Amino acid sequence: HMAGVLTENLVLQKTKVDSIQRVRKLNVCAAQLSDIGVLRRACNLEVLSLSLNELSELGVLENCPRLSELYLRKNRVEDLNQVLHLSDAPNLTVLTLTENPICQDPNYRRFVIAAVGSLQRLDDIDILPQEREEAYRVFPNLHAIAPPPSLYCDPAKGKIR
């Protein structure tokens, strides 16, 4: 019944710390994961690798203000608006979403850049100053857009709702 659910036990076995709040780096690639709600308390997580899982819903990551690098290659993210859960991540400089369905949506790269103001690199390609400027011209308001509802975060503050 916990098939696909990341558990506290598995995280703490792997990382050797006493609480989810003390997890700073976590690599759980290729673990058949579809539920990562346990990360709601991962307030100190900085480097997170979740590639090659079954994830479609990113709301738990609103609880991770320290996130610096986030690897999500080859998941099941189907809705571009899931990336709005990363809009308020002030320290997130590296993101990979390659091989999720959204990567083939028109204007995916511009949307992600315009949504995540801190980002310096997306999908293994650094974001140039002029690339960011152009993304904001196309999509000027994404930091104000409410992210989708989630079981695993409260509604983000400072959004049009």
Residue numbers in the entry: 0 to 160
Which text from the study accompanies this structure?
Cilia and flagella associated protein 410 (CFAP410) is a protein localized at the basal body of cilia/flagella and plays essential roles in ciliogenesis. Our work revealed that CFAP410 is a bimodular protein comprising two highly conserved domains, including a leucine rich repeat (LRR) motif at its N-terminus and an oligomeric helical bundle at its C-terminus. CFAP410 was shown to localize to the basal body and interacts with NEK1 and SPATA7 during ciliogenesis and DNA damage repair. Homo sapiens CFAP410 (HsCFAP410, accession code: NP_004919) is 256 amino acids long and a number of single residue mutations, including I35F, C61Y, R73P, Y107C, Y107H, V111M and L224P, have been associated with skeletal and/or retinal disorders.
Here we report a 1.0-Å resolution crystal structure of the N-terminal domain (NTD) of Trypanosoma brucei CFAP410. In the end we obtained crystals only for the construct spanning residues 1–160, which is what NTD refers to in all subsequent structural analyses of TbCFAP410. Residues 1–138 fold into a canonical leucine-rich repeat (LRR), with five tandem repeats forming a calzone-like structure. The LRR motif contains five parallelly arranged β strands forming a flat sheet on one side and an array of four short α helices on the other. Additionally, we found that residues 139–160 of TbCFAP410 forms a long hairpin-like loop, which is tightly packed on top of the helical surface of the LRR motif. All TbCFAP410 truncations with the intact loop were soluble, whereas those lacking parts or the whole loop, i.e., constructs covering residues 1–149 and 1–140, were all insoluble upon expression in E. coli. This further suggests that the loop is essential to facilitate the folding and/or to stablize the structure of the LRR motif in TbCFAP410. Location of individual residues corresponding to the five disease-causing mutations in HsCFAP410 can be clearly visualized in TbCFAP410. These residues can be grouped into three categories, including one surface residue that is fully exposed to solvent (R75), two semi-exposed residues (V37 and Y107), and two hidden residues that are completely buried in the hydrophobic core of the structure (C63 and V111).
